[PDB]
Each structure stands twice: as C-alpha cells, then as structure tokens.
Design a protein around this ligand. Structure first.
Ligand SMILES: [Fe+3]
Ligand SMILES: [Fe+3]
Ligand SMILES: [Fe+3]
Lengths: 53, 191, 53, 191, 191
C-alpha cells in the first residue's frame, strides 16, 4: 500500500519527492519487517501461513 | 474547507504510451508482485526447524526482494512516461501464494525455474504488445524490456537450471548429505 | 513480548508522533490566514521532508 | 601548383547506410542545432537584469550545450559509417531562433518540454525511416537512436514536466516568491 | 562398469531458441574462428625477418585473439539459452587459412577491412534469421547481436578504413619510410 502511495506522489502532476520518499521508507521498513516476522515465526518452531487472519 | 490546491495543467503531448502496451505493463507489475509473494513462501518453508536449509531460505528471500524491485522498476518506467496520475490503487493486489510447501530443494528450484520461465514469456508478450501496436511502436520501452528485463531473466534461468541439475544428480543416493552440502555452499560455506 | 517491545513497540511511538506532527503542520497551512499560503507551504513542506525523512 | 595529394581509393563495400535513413539523420542534426540556439536564447532571457533568474539561465545554457553535443554525436555516427566525405557544408545553418522572450519560468519550462517532445517525435521518425526502408533495415543505427537518444529524451521530458508542474502550482498566489525560491533551488541553494 | 551417472531431467520449457536462428548462430561461430585463423596468418607474415613490421604483426595477432573471444561469446550465449547439450564437436573445424602473404601493410589492412565487412553482413543475416522466423522473434538475441556485435563491427571497420586511407596516401612516393613510420606508430612509438 505504501509503495503505491510512493508511486502516486512521484507522478509528474503531484511530483512531491519528499512525500514519495516518506512512503518509500515506510514501504521498505514494512517489507523488511515482514521477512523478520516470518523468520521469528519459524525460529519459535511454527510455520508461516499467508492466509492466517 | 479547501484542503488541497486547485490542480494546474501543463502540456501533455509528451505523454505517448498507448493502451495495449500500458495494460500489458500493468499486468506485468502484478505478475512481478505475485512472484515476490511466492518466493517469500519458499523462504518461509526452508526456514522451518524441521526443514532447516538456511542457504535455500536466504536464496529465496533474496529472490523475493529482487522481484519486488522488478515491480518497482516497471512502475518507475510508467511514471517517467507520464502515466499513473490515476488508477494507481488498482495496480496491485496482495494475495496468499498458491504453493506453500516443497518436498526438497530440487522441487523448489524446479518450481522457481518454471516461474522464471513464465515471467520471461510474459515479458516477451509485453514486448510484442508494445512493439506491434499498429498505431505506435514504443521503441524505447521495447528496448528497455529487452536489454534490462530479458537480460536478467535469461541469466537467472540458466543459474537456476544449473543448480537444479547439480543437486538433482545427488538425489538418487545422497538426498540428505547432498542437499546439506549444497545448502551450505549457497551460504558460501565449504564444509 | 520482548521481541515486540524491542523490534516494534519502541519505534512505533516515534513514527506516530512524527506523522501526527506532519498532519498538525498541514492543518495550520490550510487554516491560518484563510489558507492563503497553502500552495507555497506544501512546496516548502515537501522540501523539508526531502531533508528529514 | 599542386597543393594537395592525389586522392586514393580503398574498398567501400563496408559503407552501407541508405539514402532515406541518411537524409533523416541529416535533418535531425539540423534540428538539434536549432534546439541549441533556442536554448541559448532562453539562457540570455533569464540572464537579463530585469528578469534575474540565474538558476533558469544556467539550466538553459546547460541545455544549449547538451543539444550541441547531441548534434555532434549524430555527426560522429555518420562519419563512423563512412559518410560525410562530401556534403558537409550544407549539413547546418545557424539562424536566429523563433522566440526570444518568455513571461516567466513556467512558460519557458513548458516551451522546453514542447521542444523536447518535438525532438522525441522526430527521432522516432528517423528510427522508422532507418528501420523500414525495404532495401536495408539499419539495425545498428536504430538501436543507437533508441537506446541512447530516446533514453535521454524520455528522462528529460519527465524532468521538465515535473519542474513545470511544481512551479506552476505556485503561480496563482506566489508568482514572485515561488519562482525566486525555485530558481535558487536550481542552483542547489536552499534559502 | 558404470563410469557415469544416470542422467536426470529438469523442466525444459525455458529453452526456446528456434532452429533457423540457432543454425545461423552456429555458422557465425565457425566464421569467427575462420577469421581468427586468417588474422594469425597475417601476424605470422609481418613477423618474418624479411618483412619486419612488428607493429602490424602485433595488430593482427591481437585481432586473432579478439576473433577467438567473439566465437567464445556466441558459444556462451547458446549455452545460457540451454543449447549445446549435444552437437558440440561439430561446431568448429580448424583449417589452414586461404591467404598467407600480402604485398604490404595496405593490402593487409584492406583485406582485414573486407573480412570485417563480410562478418558485419553475416551478423546482420543472423539478426534477420532470428528476428523474422514466423514462429518466434528472438528479441533478446537480436538485441545482443545488434548492441554488442554490430557495435564492435562498425567501430572496427571505421578504424581499419582510416588506417588504410592514411597509409595508402604514402604509397606512391614513400612506400618504405611511410610504412616504417606507420608501423612504429602502431606500437606507440613516435620516431
Ligand atoms: Fe521479475
Ligand atoms: Fe537533443
Ligand atoms: Fe568477430
């Protein structure tokens, strides 16, 4: 979701490099945390289920 | 209350992508994201304590991040051409991947090879749509997809195919030790 | 609990405070002096984000 | 008196460009030169004491020099292919540019965007002429124009379009201060 | 006795080159090797004590090694695409070159220019075969041959043509001293 906001603020009409950078950072951090949590789930002996609610 | 600024308009003749090509690019973006999610599931599988192949896990988590970068590069290309001033929310949809388990490293490598093979075919179809539109041959995008994206695809396929061949030869009599050693080699560790 | 405390919880407070502050700044640009400086303020604010994000 | 050396002849089969493609390249060379002259006039305008936008002046003088380099690259390509052993004097003509004044930075940026858009369309037409000649598809030149020239064109258009959008939003209420700040940012100066 | 491992099979959908294109590539590989052998003979000729043009000898031995590298690059491309799992032995044949003597540096440079001109035409024919196969337009290989191989060909032809023109102008009255000086310049020696 954050990646799409970063893209939107980087279109030629909006062209807000600062807003785009803010969302790109939020996106990169959330992506990195996704992998970290998956690794923690397996570290504790469980298995990741991508359809878990 | 007026929370935003009344939009302005600047010249638009420079915005030239045509619909068929643009739609094929949008579909490719979703395909790259789908591939990133499928690789995340492979990384998760090999990270399990009962599977314990950290070399394969890292290989696939790295592949997941690379596919996410591919999606971002295609999005940046559209933005550079003047697109995505709207219809951004509908570009992507995150959904659980189709497969979540593999019998061993060989099955995962062969599945990855097949996924890459599908992506290569899809990129070639985007190239066809962008080049053969009777109203506009998008020379630059065709060149970009051919020289950057296909280059990465062919090298990647050869790499995965070689890994699969090498490991598969060890499966008839050395399934456990063969995969164990191969897995550590993926981490740069010579036992 | 400690994993959440260390890897998520501490940093969430900083991010939320930062974003809340950004909305307060924009709210003021919109309301002060009948919102007359809004377009220049959004430009200046975006430049500020480029330097601080 | 004999002031020159009697010419010699060497094999010429390697010289293969065809007429339609070569003529389109010659026309493109004149177009690049024309663009360099129009950018010089923009640089001159923003250098005036009563306009005083040194950031815009530098932006356009830099663009003028870049267009001159584009013309030189096309000329070098023809020379590499064995052309221009004659008909060199008629390649270019320097003439006063059509426009010499702009209301402000936005008008100049929009005019530059339109000039670049015209150049992009013209390069695509050179590509068509060079690729579709029924007697000779000039693969290499088409590739050169697509990967080098169009690459620079699309990036340049996006850059100018973004600058125009950003500055134009400031014009309804902050024409003077908005342009002043934007101009200094072009010089890398944050006030 | 079982001296080898029973072969394994992995997915093959990723292997997509078509026959006409592949056969043209195989023929090009033999052509590059043939060119390397002809350049070796030129290097040998200028190395003779009675010819004694070390600059020309080095120029042609370097060209021979470069043509061998061209052959290797084409072979590597086929391997990357999944080819050459068989029919490798028949790819090349080493045979004595057709010519072994040249009257002087000009004749050798003109012969080299003609050889390069033939290679350029042959590569353009491989491109045509690979691009125009009604069943499969090999976008990536066409792009590779155009951007890498043709690039080297056109620069090389211009270089040889210039060398031939420069030296040939000296032949009507300064055959010995002109070639002697030119030869040392090839070695980077200004007498
Ligand atoms: Fe990808
Ligand atoms: Fe130009
Ligand atoms: Fe060669």
């Amino acid at each position: 979701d954050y990646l799409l906001s970063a893209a939107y603020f980087n279109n030629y009409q909006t062209n807000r490099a600062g807003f785009s950078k803010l969302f790109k950072k939020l996106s990169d951090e959330a992506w990195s945390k996704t992998i970290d949590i998956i690794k923690h789930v397996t570290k504790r002996g469980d298995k990741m289920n991508f359809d878990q609610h | 209350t007026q929370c935003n600024v009344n939009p302005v308009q600047i010249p638009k003749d420079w915005i030239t992508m045509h619909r068929s090509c643009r739609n094929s690019m949008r579909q490719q973006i979703q395909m790259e994201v789908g591939a990133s999610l499928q690789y995340l599931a492979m990384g998760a599988h090999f990270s399990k304590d009962v599977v314990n192949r950290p070399g394969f896990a890292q290989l696939f988590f790295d592949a997941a991040s690379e596919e996410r970068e591919h999606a971002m590069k295609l999005i940046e290309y559209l933005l550079m051409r003047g697109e995505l001033t709207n219809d951004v929310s509908s570009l992507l949809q995150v959904r659980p991947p189709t497969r979540s388990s593999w019998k061993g490293g060989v099955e995962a490598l062969e599945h990855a090879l097949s996924m890459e093979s599908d992506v290569t075919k899809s990129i070639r179809n985007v190239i066809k749509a962008c080049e053969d539109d009777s109203e506009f041959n998008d020379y630059h995008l065709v060149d970009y997809l051919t020289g950057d994206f296909l280059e990465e695809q062919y090298k990647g396929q050869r790499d995965l195919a070689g890994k699969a061949s090498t490991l598969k030869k060890l499966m008839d009599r050395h399934e456990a030790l063969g995969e164990f050693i191969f897995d550590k080699k993926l981490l740069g560790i010579d036992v | 609990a400690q994993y959440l405390e260390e890897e998520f919880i501490e940093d969430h407070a900083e991010k939320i405070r930062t974003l809340a502050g950004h909305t307060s700044d924009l709210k003021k640009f919109i309301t002060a002096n009948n919102g007359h400086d809004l377009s220049l303020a959004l430009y200046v604010f975006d430049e500020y984000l480029q330097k601080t994000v």
